[PDB]
Point group: C3
Chain length 406, copies 3
């Protein structure tokens, strides 16, 4: 049966029901509220567990599947589509948030480059590099947090190398192919727990707000993000599809509707990836040759919704601090929000972990994330859907562009 | 020649001879006593080095060898036998130690679940998660120590997935098969150093006791553990064998006598595993199809002797602190001593590393292990033999149970 | 075109030109001098990134390629040549530096043995063990820094095991063969950035010296190292070649001249390894059977120039501190400088990272490396060439010795 979507929709409505009723008709202490969320914590453990094997294997196999530079044009065309749509999303976000106004830079910018090239691969798998100036002289240290941006850069370069080796590298192509499949089979196992975990992860999040004045304060911030995500997903992406693929874009989006609902409930572009393959191949009849690369790479590299959210959220917190952003600061937000979408993994609440980078790029305390944290579970559900939809339209686009070489 | 056992028996009697003579006829300072133990430290380095490759590869290959759910019944029947015998050992230990009386809980219990699902596999390979409440709000951090409990859970789930993939996963079945064999060949290399390391590791341990009043104080604690291990290995395990396999159990145990002596000297269920295969297959004529799974998995998951020792040791230290354990606390010791036997690796002195968890489950300082540490090298030799014997009887039992499906 | 050497020679002369002109005609602050070096920092990131995959895979494949103990004599003969030439280099360095005089030991010596056998392979990939005595009792802790000495020992032992397994281990032979090749293909990608990175890494190093009185102070230290490296490479190595291979040694060295210039510019024995294979096989016509083992293992194990430099540098800093070295201390420098050359990786500035060990072996502060750091980029270029030349002559030597078994 079509259990995945119906069970998760039930968990969402049961999570809201539980949270609203428990928040009103009970008085949990700050400690009891933490144990109440525990079944959702264990879900977040299981998903953070799997993003290391998943990102590594999907980067390597995706790139290594480009047998030669002729097929390499399919991969190249896709990464151009990824960067183009992400910048348009960030620019749209900045234009909105400075129109609505809902409210050490060099070191944070060079730290982006240092984190693409980590000094150690094993350390990069769980720690990330930060530099500070003191007395100035620069001092750097590692702090915990998977260096996803550096593992991506290595896995793309390492994937490219393996594919060029031909029959000499095939054992590594085969090893990471099997490891990629084994990882997607483990993710499908987590999907059995995910409905129950999503219930407590939704219920616990709305139990942890003391007053709706917190929700009213952030109402105009949600309007800015949800306005941007609406414009991006309903105007921009359908338009650039139609400009390339002279077919109705909403006909293509309607075929993904089962994947978009999944993304809108589980808040994980990586976990909805099996449903994305199902829709893209069978409803939209896209060539499996390209869907094997554009979907699994784009499921983490191409996060248009996160990039927009990061830019709106960072400028919003700057406005809350009266930090009147100059055009130079706006540009450093744009660059960091672009990189933060790439560095962010496709698991629930990955946008917040990278939010610290965009805040640091303008010197804002890393703890000012706690100004927006309360509503994030709502905007996370919508940004995830744009993270998938951006890849879906890209799959149809890349087919039309590549048709001379497929 | 049969060098392994005769050389290790010599090292044990030479270690006692050296330690007793050096303790009486010399006056090493606390510093010189540490350098005297150094050849035994390097042995402990070599064995801690190998338990990561060994646990990972033996979990994956053991489970992945269950070609289908028909053979999967052999693996399922075994894990039921593992859990049953371990609980009986823990319950026996608790009953004894409260009869003889030789003398934050929720956070430590939820930390067990958080450590089955680590946020990072590379971090889990060398760090383990602990939470504290402060101001309450819960704060968590990682501290060093291989998260064996989380690597087991992943390797069993990852092994299950690979086996279901069939011909698509065979490269990973083959890779971990070779890596499992390569690890057992390295362990056989350490066995050449082990006699010399065991000499200094035994001699140094009895040089580090200042007075025999330490040994007299712990005499009734040793009587409780060694009474429990005697009852478990001479009464309970032979009985549950006979109740399943209507054959004389001591005839089967006599065939293992060469493996039991090895375990009783090297204090390592993992290092004696090659001898366990030799006896189980050739003396006891057990089907190689089942011995390939019950022995190498049970060599670390099924540690009946450690589980009994953990429960007796934790209640003993509680009695030393006048911490009069309620029935609720006794239950939390039972659950944690069960998990601590699984989390403990099959290398000399692995019971102490996990002892900290059972102590923490009742709020006892982690340093109160130093109350029992002095005698542990003796009880380690006996608990190791029950850790092997539990797997040996399980191998004969699982054969009888599975005979309809072999 | 022969772009590698001509482009790097240009970067060196352009780096000196830039550094001298910027140092005179500009006044960078200590902060601006750090950002000026940044394009060279990113080069050091890329090379430190790759030494973990490179050392692991080259140890395993090199040893695992010795199909049997008959070919094993080729590998055995080589490691005898490695240790012999390294000790001769260290002894030459000690004799010089005590003739010219240009100016807790047990714990540091046992720490060498503890670091050959790490308690964890994943921790060894990025941390290294150090012990201290306090109140004495010994306390140990891990600190960051790849434990190259322990990864080598495991990879040689693990490589030996795989080769003995035959057809049962071939999947691991194949896996590390492909991973070794994939790593050398990534290093060849870094070579495209290396000219630009070498320019700023040379220019920035001479911008960071305030006065030439620093260079005059260290002039007699450079004379001691460069005298030792001249004697070792022009006298000793040609002699031991001629004593084994009764052919003109400078005819063989002239065939390597393209590899020696590469080593003398990029300061990386590992990065010049492809050029070393090219010269050794095609100019010097050495059997590919032996060059496949003596070059890639010797590219990190056999560092005769580093070992000489380490001994001269450590005794020099002792003389600066009036620490009048007894014959016992000289011996502990010899042992630690030998091990430090093995522990040092073949990337620019790897000698300094291990310098801390030789200083610690005689109790000198780890920060007294900053007494010699200023000139190190110059001596690094010359020591790298002796690190390659030692392997080159060894390749011709091992061919003559092994000719009865090839
Ligand atoms: N939850 C988003 C990631 C994010 O929130 O940044 C996704 O999986 O696409
Ligand atoms: N030494 C035991 C483990 C322990 O003491 O906990 C064994 O190897 O079975
Ligand atoms: N740069 C040297 C290593 C060192 O300086 O210690 C080499 O690659 O051979
Ligand atoms: Hg929420
Ligand atoms: Hg002992
Ligand atoms: Hg320099
Ligand atoms: Na994009
Ligand atoms: Na995406
Ligand atoms: Na991303
Ligand atoms: Na058991
Ligand atoms: Na066991
Ligand atoms: Na265990
Ligand atoms: Na040498
Ligand atoms: Na070398
Ligand atoms: Na070296």
């Amino acid at each position: 049966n079509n259990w995945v979507l119906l069970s998760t929709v039930a968990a969402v409505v049961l999570g809201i029901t539980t949270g609203v009723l428990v928040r009103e008709h009970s008085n949990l202490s700050t400690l009891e509220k933490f144990y109440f969320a525990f079944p959702g914590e264990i879900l977040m453990r299981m998903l953070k567990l799997i993003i290391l094997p998943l990102i590594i294997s999907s980067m390597i196999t995706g790139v290594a599947a480009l047998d030669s530079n002729v097929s390499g044009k399919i991969g190249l065309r896709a990464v151009v589509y990824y960067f183009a749509t992400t910048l348009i999303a960030v620019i749209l976000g900045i234009v909105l948030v400075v129109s609505i106004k809902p409210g050490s830079t060099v070191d944070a910018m060079l730290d982006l480059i240092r984190n693409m090239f980590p000094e150690n691969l094993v350390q990069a798998a769980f720690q990330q590099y930060k530099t500070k100036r003191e007395e100035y002289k620069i001092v750097g240290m590692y702090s915990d947090g998977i260096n996803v941006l550096g593992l991506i850069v290595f896995a793309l370069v390492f994937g490219l190398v393996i594919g060029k080796m031909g029959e000499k590298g095939q054992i590594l192509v085969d090893f990471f192919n099997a490891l990629s499949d084994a990882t997607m089979k483990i993710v499908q196992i987590i999907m059995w727990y995910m409905p129950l975990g999503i219930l407590f992860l939704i219920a616990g999040c709305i139990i942890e707000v003391e007053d709706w004045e917190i929700f009213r304060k952030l109402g105009l911030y949600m309007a800015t993000v949800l306005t941007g995500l609406a414009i991006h997903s309903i105007v921009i992406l359908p338009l650039i599809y139609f400009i390339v693929v002279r077919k109705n874009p909403f006909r293509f989006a309607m075929g993904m509707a089962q994947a978009l609902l999944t993304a809108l409930m589980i808040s994980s572009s990586s976990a909805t990836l099996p449903v994305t393959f199902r829709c893209a191949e069978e409803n939209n009849q896209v060539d499996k040759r390209i869907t094997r690369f554009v979907l699994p790479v784009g499921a983490t590299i191409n996060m248009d919704g996160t990039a927009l959210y990061e830019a709106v959220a960072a400028v919003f917190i700057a406005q809350l601090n009266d930090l009147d952003l100059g055009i130079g600061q706006i540009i450093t937000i744009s660059i960091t929000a672009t990189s933060a979408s790439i560095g962010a993994a496709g698991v629930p609440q990955a946008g917040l972990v990278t939010m610290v980078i965009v805040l640091s790029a303008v010197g804002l305390p890393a703890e000012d994330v706690t100004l927006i944290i309360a509503v994030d579970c709502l905007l996370d559900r919508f940004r995830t859907m744009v993270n998938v939809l951006g890849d879906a339209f890209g799959t149809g686009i890349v087919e039309k562009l590549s048709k001379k070489e497929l």
